[PDB]
Amino acid sequence: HSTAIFSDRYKGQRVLGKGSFGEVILCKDKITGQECAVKVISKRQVKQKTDKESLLREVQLLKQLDHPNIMKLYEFFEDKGYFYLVGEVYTGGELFDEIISRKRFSEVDAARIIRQVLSGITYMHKNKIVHRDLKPENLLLESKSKDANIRIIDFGLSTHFEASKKMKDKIGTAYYIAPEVLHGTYDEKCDVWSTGVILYILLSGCPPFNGANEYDILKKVEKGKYTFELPQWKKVSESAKDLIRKMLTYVPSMRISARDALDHEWIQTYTKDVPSLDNAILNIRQFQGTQKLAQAALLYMGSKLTSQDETKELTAIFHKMDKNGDGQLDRAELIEGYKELMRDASMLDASAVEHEVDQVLDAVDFDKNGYIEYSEFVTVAMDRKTLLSRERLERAFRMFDSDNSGKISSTELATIFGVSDVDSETWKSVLSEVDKNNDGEVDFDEFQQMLLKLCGN
Numbered sequence: 001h002s003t004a005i006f007s008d009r010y011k012g013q014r015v016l017g018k019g020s021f022g023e024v025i026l027c028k029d030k031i032t033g034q035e036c037a038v039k040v041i042s043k044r045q046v047k048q049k050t051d052k053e054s055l056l057r058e059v060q061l062l063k064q065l066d067h068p069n070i071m072k073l074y075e076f077f078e079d080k081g082y083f084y085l086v087g088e089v090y091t092g093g094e095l096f097d098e099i100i101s102r103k104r105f106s107e108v109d110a111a112r113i114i115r116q117v118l119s120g121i122t123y124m125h126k127n128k129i130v131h132r133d134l135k136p137e138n139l140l141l142e143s144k145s146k147d148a149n150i151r152i153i154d155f156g157l158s159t160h161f162e163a164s165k166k167m168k169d170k171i172g173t174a175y176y177i178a179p180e181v182l183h184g185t186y187d188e189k190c191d192v193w194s195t196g197v198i199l200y201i202l203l204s205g206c207p208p209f210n211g212a213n214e215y216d217i218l219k220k221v222e223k224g225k226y227t228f229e230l231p232q233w234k235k236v237s238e239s240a241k242d243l244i245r246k247m248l249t250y251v252p253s254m255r256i257s258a259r260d261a262l263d264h265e266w267i268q269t270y271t272k273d274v275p276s277l278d279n280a281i282l283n284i285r286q287f288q289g290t291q292k293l294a295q296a297a298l299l300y301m302g303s304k305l306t307s308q309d310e311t312k313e314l315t316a317i318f319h320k321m322d323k324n325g326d327g328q329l330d331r332a333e334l335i336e337g338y339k340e341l342m343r344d345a346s347m348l349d350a351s352a353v354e355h356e357v358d359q360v361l362d363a364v365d366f367d368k369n370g371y372i373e374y375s376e377f378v379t380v381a382m383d384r385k386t387l388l389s390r391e392r393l394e395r396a397f398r399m400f401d402s403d404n405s406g407k408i409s410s411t412e413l414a415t416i417f418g419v420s421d422v423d424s425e426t427w428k429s430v431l432s433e434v435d436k437n438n439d440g441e442v443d444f445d446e447f448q449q450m451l452l453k454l455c456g457n
């Protein structure tokens with residue numbers, strides 16, 4: 001009897017994106033052609049909280065659960081360096097990204113959204129599974145269809161894996177986390193809190209607990225106080241605010257349960273004219289842009305650091321390989337050395353590496369059947385990734401700059417770097433080095449420059 005190997009069954013199509021605990025890779029069954037979204041959790045980057053026995057049992061259970069608002073899980077694999085969580089793929093993107101793209105959004109729309117969330121949660125709770133880390137990024141739409149269902153992701157991971165302490169992994173988490181979770185004693189009621197935060201945001205476009213940085217947000221959450229004294233709350237029903245109050249009740253025993261929330265007057269009324277919440281849409285669009293850009297900023301810096309690391313490592317690997325030191329390696333050698341390097345969740349296969357080497361070779365017009373200048377290859381393979389990272393950031397800059405002004409203001413930078421948890425006098429210092437004209441604003445290139453300076457370049 002043999003232990004099942006992931007890559008024997010699945011091939012990687014492409015990267016779907018970055019999630020909690022690992023990279024998510026779109027994959028395809030080598031026989032049946034079934035497409036799946038595979039979260040790949042790196043054992044080196046993420047520590048386990050539970051034992052083997054406890055994990056395997058949870059997986060086994062999760063595979064048998066079924067609910068339209070919960071991500072479907074098909075398979076589980078494990079090897080020396082990784083876990084592989086194989087689930088159903090969803091094509092509709094993040095809930096909030098869909099919402100800002102609309103012209104109209106009412107309490108009716110919000111109620112139908114929250115019912116779906118509460119429904120999925122209620123089910124998982126019945127089965128003694130807690131999310132804990134529930135937020136808008138974990139709410140995916142099933143498809144691109146207007147009336148596509150919401151699929152909750154990452155249920156059950158937090159019980160078994162330790163959360164990353166890295167800011168690039170924590171963006172947005174602080175707004176939604178329940179106070180009891182901070183202090184250590186928590187139960188399924190923490191998920192009702194998070195949903196309550198999400199609802200508050202849906203109807204006002206602002207987080208109830210907010211701050212200049214991660215810790216300030218957490219101070220507010222811990223204190224647990226909030227208000228409906230914003231202007232845009234005047235547009236909202238009393239019942240909506242009543243449910244929010246009940247979900248954002250501090251003491252968890254006093255907090256309304258998920259199942260009881262589904263029976264709340266507000267849910268019952270609005271899910272059976274209602275004005276549009278135009279101000280809420282405005283605020284959510286701004287909120288989302290800011291979050292997405294701070295994320296992009298952190299990923300860019302991370303990619304730059306990774307590249308500096310990998311560039312020198314790859315060169316050192318090939319140098320050792322280049323035994324007579326003439327600078328000439330062949331394709332099979334480049335592959336072996338690239339393999340030794342990756343020893344990219346997307347590259348966890350021999351054929352993946354063969355493919356990627358070939359892509360690099362084709363770009364530089366090097367003949368693949370002869371011998372190659374490895375120094376030249378290295379430059380291209382890394383520049384590709386550097387170029388890719390630059391493009392992702394730019395897109396985020398342009399989206400944030402909704403007025404197409406070409407610029408980001410000093411106030412805006414304060415917000416962005418606050419969310420990125422970059423020290424104030426630190427970024428200001430780097431801004432001072434770049435903005436020698438006292439314009440109090442930066443263009444894309446200047447902004448990029450700052451980020452390079454904030455990662456030791």
Ligand SMILES: CCOc1ccc2cc(-c3nn(CC4CCNCC4)c4ncnc(N)c34)ccc2c1
Nearest residue numbers: 016017019024037039085086087088089090153154
């Ligand atoms: C017991 C849990 O086992 C599993 C197994 C697979 C999982 C797959 C996904 C997943 N991630 N992404 C990438 C999106 C990029 C844009 N930002 C939002 C996410 C996805 N995109 C589409 N569909 C997906 N299913 C995912 C998330 C959690 C999973 C958990």
